[PDB]
Symmetry: D2
Subunit: 479 residues, 4 copies
């Protein structure tokens, strides 16, 4: 078995394969630099209920994704125990918090933040999850700007966070302990013929043979498989959801006892603080879907993240020392849903397109793919997210056009801007036409989700034309 | 018969006038004051029948504040039958006194957490303690409002049976009801109260005339103490009343709509606040600023107009931005120097006062009127109003420490309510550097008396000569009573 | 008759009234209009004798704009003797028409570089071209001003002999001078101009009366075209005039001080602008907003009041913030649909128009009055005003492309003048998304006519029915003239 | 020995190293310091060859400030031939030390008028006094810039022959030139200077070794006084040097473009400033914050990063907003406690110092190097450096009153540079309430010494124990020198 990719998904599937099939040789590809790596740029939150939006839970596909997140949360305590078991005290602790506080402030669009707060409360009650709405005065540690302060707060019990760096180290160590081998090169090409995988050409010119190849190369995953015959229009594209986060040494070495977060905001950015050991906090995280990868933060991303954290969470962060600006690529599927499971090529598997919550879902996703590889049926709810598929249409064009204008306006309210009171209504009216024109031009059948539609709107004419051709080639393949 | 003169033609003068005229067929009652109602609080009022909406943590932390609150809750019970009795003297064409039955209190972040969050909690507690009908409601369920999202409320409280009146229709109904009961309106001002052998003789008017009386009731708003202070000893025995200058506006809404309820915040920096009071005929009332001034002012500052308009358009309804301004209104809330009203009798036989009611004299008017009329008839009026007798040593309802904490918090709230945008370290620095100057002023003014925050800020920014005159006043009061 | 009726009692009606009365003592001249001056531009004006201060790059880029500018410079020469002749009919106690001799133009960054920087350069160029006395001065040398440092000017231009008048004292002096010259004031409105056999017979008034005349001069401000449009054919032969609704204010300064000069910016988004005009007696005039409205409006919006006050307090003097608001004033600048005035004769014998002067009819008034009186006497009046004859095809002074560039720039300027605070990518995005809708509207309205930016924005945000009626109007004009 | 040890591998150490090596080929010169250059000012510098751009009204108001300015002007004359001599030891492929020949100073309103307007005037005066080539230019003529219109400059000044260097390429050229002249690089730190019988013996290094020398030149940046203060008496005879922590950034521009000139403002609140220094290969340098810290700091605060980025994106080029952040750089400007450099000889024979150069040691480096080498050869070096001898009583370059005016003005400037948005009365209130606490601190610290504003603000917000330690330090210095 060859696992292509050394993020949370590759290493998690690597560990599960190595541990459950001691009869098989498992090799994991990827380099210590983890170029464009989502996992090392993550806090990370074990986000299930915190990831709930009204828009997600309005669609059948969104409700399915949410069910999987709730299932994954149950696996984390024993998964962490099993990974820490391979180490010693000096390796540090994977878990950094047990609980999450969701804050509601007015530094955002009512149409996102108010709707999403209501949706989180409903989803918690529906799941019989332990939680309570608490007085904001009872939230320890926070020191917001009064004009940026929360007026409601929600305590979620047993929804916590991990140190993504300590998790990656624990996964690598656990992989080696179970007889896995780490080969620090990248796959250049998957070799297959007579409808079956033969192995992987690496970027040092070598060839590694295999009966099974599992592609978990984050935002590079579809580009790798798309080289095989037909698969260019049978595996949904995955783009770079470029995310900026930061490590901050707090002014007094303090940190909150819980995750602090807002609900998901304009184009799947959001504000959160994840506790870390040793007088550090993680703050995150911006999001921008990019049609080509980017490995450096924009000035705008850094200013936005810092401004939100200092005003809405703790003014003490303003005088705190910046240790690191981190950048990683959320694997952003073109149809808005993950690519998990088997392929029309025997022995070829994919684990990708997980966007904001692959790290959280990792133990569940790993166990699902390993079950499938062993001739099992894995987890009942994952079939719709099979990687070889027509593009999913989870929303009407009308729903998406309402969403993209609302998210565009939310980039103003989240800044937060100060404008003449008539300007927002004028901007809303003048945004509708151009987005409706773009959606109608791209395809008669497919509509990109808002996060991708905004990226396409502001891309070059040539990039838009190439996407029109892609959508036409997909329609031809499947209809 | 034995003549009564009421000095003042606001809500308190006219309300006592109506009650005397109706209950005392033995008395001829003459009410003084001009149609212009110079510096008049009542015509500038929305007005809210504010009892629970007027609750602050700071008010209910003092015994005097809790006593004042009990009286406001009692007054609310009198309004339905009072309005019936006033409308009875008119016809349909005179219009309706009541403009709303219910109030929604909104909590947004365009203000200081130390005022708005504390006060929202205090209002909820006071409602529950009183067993008053109310509920916390979803903000999405508040009809009509269309705030700027960055200025929007995240909590809302529905108060059942706490409503509003049209202050103009109330004044017209009071005047008409006064005349119907045999009262006479004499449109001149009192210049001087005449007394000798410890009894009132009557009033010199500003047309040079003298009107004799056995009883003089002073309800001249912010002018009330200045009028009586001319009589022997009374300069240091009747607490001073200053002008709580308030700006409000009448707006013709873009579509002729209005909310079904009062919309308000809790009381904000130095007893300003944001509210919308429904009116008939496609008008809304928006209010209201507050600034304690050591001398009267009858025109709005540019700052007051911009602040009121900016708050209403952002926090209540952006539609008000394109709405037509009909009138900017200015009136003087009678602001007592010791923070409590001046209600009842005097050391001068036949001399009575009804004043120093600040934000809620109009709401309390039927109760206050019935109290003073009962006292004039040899009754005991309303239990609990004895503490607010007009001839008194200055009340000390708070420690100097409580007031110094309050004045710094209210100063900072003028920033958060703007709302300002500043470097994140600036507020803490300003807070630290405000404490010393206010502590120095409080210590300099008097060893015994501390002005409430609303007055202390006015004194801080007044001329050296005005501060020195107040030091002398406080010293003369201490000498009189100790 | 040989009787003359002037319809309208603003600066243009009264100025032409005075000139007719003085030069034809043999004829009866009657001037119509009421003391209320409903929607009156003149009483809402400061007013600046604005010639060089009114220069914009956009105006001087067109032949028609350069012609209008030449006339403004000519008008300035008439003011000293005009004022002498008007004050001559009064006494010392009537007060002085002139309130300042000089103007300082300030350049700050509370606005669009594409308007304010371009316009500052255009004013400097026009002054140098005219050999007019002026100096660029250090901002530190501008007396009186006390701006917010973040709103302060960094350049200042002293214009010698470009001053201001008190519009109220001017109107009083014109009425008095009209009577002195044998004019009669009849305080009613014209309802109808009566004509037949291609000649005026007189005016029906709103009291039901009929006044006969050989000459009718229409100077009814924004009502002028609506009045004449009732006569056969004239609906599509006299360019429409709309209401350029303008808000200004009178402020009593905190210390009774004022600047010795006019203080102004260049003309800003959609022909608004910021200025302070000195007044006597501790008052200043601040102005002035502009919004072209397809129907008249006589009350300020909240938005207009907040914008004017915010600009004046930040950019001119923070002392205005604590100053007392005396009056909010609203008047209608007569806004011609083709961007140029309507001055002179008609196809109806004895029917004359003096209107559509927008921002600078008051400044041009002595020149315009003398021009129309010369024409009435069979003269040729002033060279260069023939192009602005009232009975005309709509002028096309700019390409559709120039106007579309202008309307997007002016739209963006409403943001920068606020001033807004936005993410740095938002303005470019808004600019890109504004171009298409304005291009679509311009193409839809007419194949030949394009409204100037100030009108195009009003049409963009008007009702579908109002847009359709304008499409029909433009089509009927094209049919009449082509 | 006749051996020379240079302690420090910044611009000053390497520059003096090169000059010694080149002029004394007979002697062994060893330079200490590690490639990491911990807290190093030089590698965090753009850097501007700032002479006229560094002019402030406040600097040129003092005799010591005028002396410092004269030296900066003298240094600028040396740069062309100094660069020629350093590039001569390399080839084209080493890159070019010079990145721009000219500087444009921009004046915008994102700052305090009391700093930015005064400083712009002071720069213009200093250029004219020096007969320096310069022109005030139209802002529209400044190439490349694309500011937010609300943040845009309205004046611009072109300074000819005041340019910038790549600090990294300069350090590489200095190291290469040092080796070419026979210098030896020993990559360890000095721990201790050894001296007895009033003469240097050499240096103990942090690897435990001892290097003998007849001459030790201390150029260890902000660590320089701490190193020499260990010798007898010198703790209170060598003025303390603190860390002027400065944050800068390298940005890859969206299109690989950059300006042809340095772009800068004048020096702003507490010796921060905004500038962009061109670099090769599609990079720009932006700088630079300043904070005097009583202990060294090697990481940027969030506040420093946000402020730098916000100023550059608004005031210089909005294109930087979408540009990629390559590196946040932090270095320590050596901040002398008395505000002036420590340059020259000591009471210890063979012991020299080159430090406390704050914002402009890099610029002054060729002049400072030549000065110390002249002194070591028994010369008098450069006229006017005598006041800045390292062994001295603390300089008192300003009255306590001047410094107290300055510290309040600089405090207020941190608001205007943000830029904040606050109620118009708040700034005057803050100014009044800042004066007392700073006056109290100045009076408490010492009866004779007053820290300059940049240090006084750091002391104001430091711990009580840190303030008390400074009171003791000042008392020990007074005792030593009086
Ligand atoms: C700023 C940020 C914040 C986040 N916060 C959270 C959070 O709070 N909670 C959460 O659950 N998740 C979070 N995530 C992550 C999210 O869950 C992702 O979907 C998840 O990390 C995806 O993991 P992955 O292993 O699929 O991809 P990655 O983590 O990107 O791993 C892919 C790896 O494969 C390597 N690779 C690429 N090409 C090749 C090749 N040809 N051969 C070999 N190796 C290759 C890459 O270099 C990389 O190291 C966050 C991500 C970002 C960017
Ligand atoms: C902006 C604003 C908003 C308000 N909103 C509310 C509200 O929502 N709810 C509420 O309950 N109350 C409100 N109030 C009013 C508050 O309750 C006042 O305390 C109350 O109106 C005081 O009434 P009064 O009759 O004592 O005084 P006033 O209403 O001031 O009446 C005094 C009258 O006496 C006249 N007078 C003065 N001197 C003489 C003289 N020498 N001789 C004769 N006549 C004289 C004055 O001209 C005046 O007309 C508001 C007031 C203001 C200013």
């Amino acid at each position: 078995v060859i696992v292509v990719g050394n993020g949370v998904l590759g290493l998690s599937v690597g560990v599960e394969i190595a541990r459950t099939r001691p009869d098989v040789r498992v090799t994991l590809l990827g380099k210590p630099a983890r170029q464009y790596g989502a996992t090392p740029a993550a806090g990370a939150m074990l986000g299930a209920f915190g990831e709930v939006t009204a828009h997600a839970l309005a669609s059948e596909h969104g409700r399915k994704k949410h069910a999987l997140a709730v299932q994954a949360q149950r696996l984390w305590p024993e998964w962490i125990e099993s990974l820490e078991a391979t180490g010693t005290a000096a390796d540090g602790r994977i878990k950094t918090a047990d609980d999450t506080v969701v804050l509601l402030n007015t530094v955002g669009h009512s149409a996102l933040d108010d709707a999403n707060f209501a949706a989180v409360l409903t989803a918690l009650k529906e799941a019989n999850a332990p939680h309570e709405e608490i007085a904001v005065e009872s939230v320890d540690w926070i020191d917001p700007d009064p004009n940026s302060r929360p007026l409601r707060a929600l305590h979620i019990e047993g929804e916590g966070s991990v140190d993504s760096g300590i998790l990656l180290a624990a996964l690598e160590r656990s992989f080696l302990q179970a007889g896995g081998r780490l080969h620090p090169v990248d796959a250049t090409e998957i070799r297959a013929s007579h409808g079956r995988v033969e192995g992987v050409v690496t970027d040092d010119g070598d060839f590694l043979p295999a009966g099974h190849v599992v592609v978990a190369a984050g935002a590079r995953s579809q580009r790798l498989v798309a080289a095989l015959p037909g698969l260019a229009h049978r595996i949904p594209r995955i783009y770079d959801g470029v995310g900026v986060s930061a490590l901050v040494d707090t002014w007094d070495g303090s940190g909150p006892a819980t995750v602090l977060r807002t609900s998901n905001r304009a184009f799947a950015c959001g504000l959160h603080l994840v506790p870390r050991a040793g007088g550090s906090v993680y703050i995150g995280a911006t999001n921008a879907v990019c049609l080509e990868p980017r490995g450096a933060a924009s000035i705008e991303e850094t200013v936005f993240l810092f401004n939100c954290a200092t005003h809405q969470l703790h003014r003490g962060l303003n005088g705190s020392e910046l240790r690191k600006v981190q950048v990683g690529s959320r694997p952003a599927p073109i149809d808005g849903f993950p690519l998990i499971g088997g392929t029309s090529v025997e022995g070829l598997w994919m684990l990708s397109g997980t966007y904001r919550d692959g790290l959280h879902m990792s133990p569940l996703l790993a166990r699902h793919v390993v079950s499938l590889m062993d001739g099992g049926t894995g987890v009942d709810g994952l079939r719709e997210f099979r990687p070889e598929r027509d593009l999913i249409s989870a929303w009407s064009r009308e729903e998406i056009l309402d969403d993209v204008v609302r998210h565009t306006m939310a980039t103003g309210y989240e800044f937060p801007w100060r404008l003449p009171l008539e300007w927002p209504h004028m901007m809303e009216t003048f945004l509708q036409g151009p987005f409706a024109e773009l959606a109608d031009r791209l395809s008669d059948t497919y509509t990109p989700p808002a996060d991708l539609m905004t990226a396409i709107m502001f891309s070059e004419r040539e990039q838009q034309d190439e996407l029109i051709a892609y959508y036409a080639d997909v329609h031809r393949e499947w209809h």
